[PDB]
Amino acid sequence: LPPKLLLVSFDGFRADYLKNYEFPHLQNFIKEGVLVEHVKNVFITKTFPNHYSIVTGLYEESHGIVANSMYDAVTKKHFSDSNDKDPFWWNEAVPIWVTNQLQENRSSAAAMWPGTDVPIHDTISSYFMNYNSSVSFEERLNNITMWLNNSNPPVTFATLYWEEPDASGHKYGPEDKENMSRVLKKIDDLIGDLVQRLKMLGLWENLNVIITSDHGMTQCSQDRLINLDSCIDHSYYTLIDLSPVAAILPKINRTEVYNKLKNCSPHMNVYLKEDIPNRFYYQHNDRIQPIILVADEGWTIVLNESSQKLGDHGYDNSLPSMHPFLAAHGPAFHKGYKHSTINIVDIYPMMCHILGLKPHPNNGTFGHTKCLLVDQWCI
Numbered sequence: 369l370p371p372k373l374l375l376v377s378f379d380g381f382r383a384d385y386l387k388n389y390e391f392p393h394l395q396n397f398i399k400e401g402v403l404v405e406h407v408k409n410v411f412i413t414k415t416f417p418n419h420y421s422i423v424t425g426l427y428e429e430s431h432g433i434v435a436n437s438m439y440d441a442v443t444k445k446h447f448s449d450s451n452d453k454d455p456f457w458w459n460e461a462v463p464i465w466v467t468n469q470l471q472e473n474r475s476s477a478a479a480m481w482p483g484t485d486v487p488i489h490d491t492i493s494s495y496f497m498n499y500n501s502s503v504s505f506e507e508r509l510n511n512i513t514m515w516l517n518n519s520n521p522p523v524t525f526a527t528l529y530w531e532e533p534d535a536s537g538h539k540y541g542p543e544d545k546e547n548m549s550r551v552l553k554k555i556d557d558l559i560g561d562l563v564q565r566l567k568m569l570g571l572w573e574n575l576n577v578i579i580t581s582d583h584g585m586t587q588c589s590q591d592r593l594i595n596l597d598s599c600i601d602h603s604y605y606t607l608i609d610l611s612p613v614a615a616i617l618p619k620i621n622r623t624e625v626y627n628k629l630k631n632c633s634p635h636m637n638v639y640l641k642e643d644i645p646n647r648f649y650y651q652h653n654d655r656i657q658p659i660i661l662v663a664d665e666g667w668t669i670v671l672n673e674s675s676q677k678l679g680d681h682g683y684d685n686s687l688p689s690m691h692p693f694l695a696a697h698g699p700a701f702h703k704g705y706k707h708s709t710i711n712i713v714d715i716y717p718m719m720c721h722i723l724g725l726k727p728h729p730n731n732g733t734f735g736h737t738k739c740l741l742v743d744q745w746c747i
């Protein structure tokens with residue numbers, strides 16, 4: 369009987385949601401498991417880059433998914449959330465489902481996790497779902513758990529992904545407590561459905577389950593806008609990604625573009641690529657454009673017609689508002705332990721340890737996770 373692990377992400381689950389709303393089902397999951405109250409994720413704090421960091425243990429400059437929208441000047445290739453199936457974009461790293469799939473008599477399974485419908489280094493999970501946001505949580509849940517329960521050879525690593533509370537966090541903004549409370553109650557119910565389902569199938573006691581997320585959300589406002597069209601003409605540059613980290617590809621002298629942009633708003637930092645702060649680990653990749661604009665927390669970079677979005681993320685990964693949480697339950701995990709923080713790149717070496725996989729070189733520190741694990745010294 370090999371170890372099994374289910375990795376679950378509810379997109380956009382800001383850590384402090386746990387302190388401001390009631391999560392009876394999550395509380396239950398935590399009570400007999402472990403909670404990391406907030407996870408320091410990676411810059412930029414967007415969906416595709418952070419999900420890949422979870423499954424590779426790498427910073428974004430290293431795994432190469434540096435935004436939800438990218439342009440590679442050399443190949444002329446474009447990446448976006450919808451247009452995300454060219455392996456070119458995934459192949460700078462090897463995610464854990466691949467390493468798991470490559471072991472004899474083991475399989476990986478997936479239900480909607482970013483990249484799991486793409487062959488990466490020519491390897492795809494035995495079971496996966498082509499991305500389709502219309503597929504209900506129940507269907508994702510019932511299928512991924514069936515696969516974990518049945519399947520020959522055994523499924524030992526599985527992913528499960530859900531688009532909320534990110535989608536509604538964007539719509540309402542995290543400060544809209546009336547509306548976010550209904551969103552998050554639904555998430556807690558889904559976690560309840562997950563636990564009920566594990567108990568029904570007899571998986572609850574032997575399956576390792578991690579419930580986590582990619583980033584948080586912060587409130588945006590009409591009083592906090594930076595309009596690039598009021599600062600620089602379109603002819604000067606091509607916009608690769610917009611807000612709150614704008615990726616700017618100059619059409620003319622980069623110096624001329626930089627001089628305009630650095631005098632646009634005191635509520636963003638304007639960086640030549642080579643001046644991007646080292647703390648972000650967001651420089652050493654050709655997919656990072658010659659200039660980036662980083663808006664301060666709660667500020668939005670806009671064009672004349674950019675639509676309103678009351679919540680957003682992407683900002684500085686040191687901001688608590690951008691941090692997700694992590695919870696876990698199962699034979700590898702202690703019962704009733706709470707820990708303050710780990711880094712999101714630390715999840716990978718922990719998962720490899722649970723599954724008995726040799727990790728690829730990575731930027732995580734296994735030591736940070738030892739207090740969560742039953743076989744490990746906790747200092």
Ligand SMILES: *[C@@H]1O[C@H](CO)[C@@H](O[C@@H]2O[C@H](CO)[C@@H](O)[C@H](O)[C@H]2NC(C)=O)[C@H](O)[C@H]1NC(C)=O
Binds near residue numbers: 426430
């Ligand atoms: C994050 O981990 C990656 C993987 O080990 C590191 O990437 C290496 O970087 C060194 C630079 O010292 C290169 O010589 C290696 O060839 C790289 N290896 C791979 C597989 O990319 C990266 O340096 C780490 N990041 C930090 C900030 O330490």
Ligand SMILES: Nc1ncnc2c1ncn2[C@@H]1O[C@H](COP(=O)(O)O)[C@@H](O)[C@H]1O
Binds near residue numbers: 379416436449499534
């Ligand atoms: N495979 C996929 N294809 C298309 N869209 C996706 C996929 N996975 C996630 N998404 C959506 O893309 C969003 C990324 O935008 P953001 O949340 O602003 O980072 C996610 O929150 C999902 O709603």
Ligand SMILES: *[C@@H]1O[C@H](CO)[C@@H](O)[C@H](O)[C@H]1NC(C)=O
Binds near residue numbers: 507511514
């Ligand atoms: C879920 O599983 C059913 C049968 O168990 C399968 O027919 C269906 O295609 C799956 N849904 C997906 C892959 O979205």
Ligand SMILES: *[C@@H]1O[C@H](CO)[C@@H](O)[C@H](O)[C@H]1NC(C)=O
Binds near residue numbers: 501
């Ligand atoms: C997405 O899922 C829904 C529900 O299963 C289905 O009706 C729809 O046809 C799917 N879209 C594609 C492109 O398969």
Ligand SMILES: [Zn+2]
Binds near residue numbers: 380414583
């Ligand atoms: Zn996300």
Ligand SMILES: [Zn+2]
Binds near residue numbers: 415534535538681
């Ligand atoms: Zn989002």
